Amino acid sequence: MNIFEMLRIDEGLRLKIYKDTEGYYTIGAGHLLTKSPSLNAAKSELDKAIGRNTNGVATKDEAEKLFNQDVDAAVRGILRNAKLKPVYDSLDAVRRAALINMVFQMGETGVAGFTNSLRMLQQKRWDEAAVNLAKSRWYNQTPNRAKRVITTFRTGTWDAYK
Ligand SMILES: [Cl-]
Ligand SMILES: [Cl-]
């Protein structure tokens, strides 16, 4: 198991523009296109991202390329973030993937906001962090995914994904 396989399970890989859990236009493995209600705007963003007139449809390779870029960007965002970097540096390889997953889903700013949970993760207080992470809109809105990530932080294993 690795970060890509993990996110593939959590996000899937759709080849036609679709609406995410929040009703926003997305493509591939959770690549948000726009928060605008407009399908046209979505299509415009898609074409700009892939570099061709797509007509709302991407090929598998194109989607995968977007996926690779997004994973790379999440990691880099973490490393550049003053609040995130120290937690990431303190974790083992499995838990680092869990942190990457949260950043991929909610953006750096969003995760950076879980102040208390981050401090707990940094102190290796696993069960405490898991409880804290669960008190969030994130857990209430996408519970199954949040439980998978939470368990990963709690145990340090990939059990929730196997
Ligand atoms: Cl892009
Ligand atoms: Cl879910």
Swiss-Prot record:
Changing residue 30 to F: Almost complete loss of enzymatic activity. The enzyme is destabilized by 1.5 kcal/mol. Its main location: host cell. SUPFAM superfamilies: Lysozyme-like. It comes from the Viruses. It is found in: Host cytoplasm. Keywords: Antimicrobial, Bacteriolytic enzyme, Cytolysis, Glycosidase, Host cell lysis by virus, Host cytoplasm, Hydrolase, Viral release from host cell. GO terms for cellular component: host cell cytoplasm. Substrate binds at residues 32, 104, 117, 132. Changing residue 117 to I: 500-fold decrease in enzymatic activity. It catalyses: Hydrolysis of (1->4)-beta-linkages between N-acetylmuramic acid and N-acetyl-D-glucosamine residues in a peptidoglycan and between N-acetyl-D-glucosamine residues in chitodextrins. The keyword Hydrolase applies. The active site is at 11 (proton donor/acceptor), 20 (proton donor/acceptor). Optimum pH is 7.3. GO terms for biological process: cell wall macromolecule catabolic process; defense response to bacterium; peptidoglycan catabolic process; viral release from host cell by cytolysis. Changing residue 30 to A: Almost complete loss of enzymatic activity. Induction: Expressed late in the viral replication. Its EC number is 3.2.1.17. Changing residue 20 to C: Nearly no effet on specific enzymatic activity. One of its GO terms (molecular function) is lysozyme activity. PANTHER family: T4-TYPE LYSOZYME 1-RELATED. Endolysin with lysozyme activity that degrades host peptidoglycans and participates with the holin and spanin proteins in the sequential events which lead to the programmed host cell lysis releasing the mature viral particles. Once the holin has permeabilized the host cell membrane, the endolysin can reach the periplasm and break down the peptidoglycan layer. Belongs to the glycosyl hydrolase 24 family. This is Endolysin. It comes from Enterobacteria phage T4.
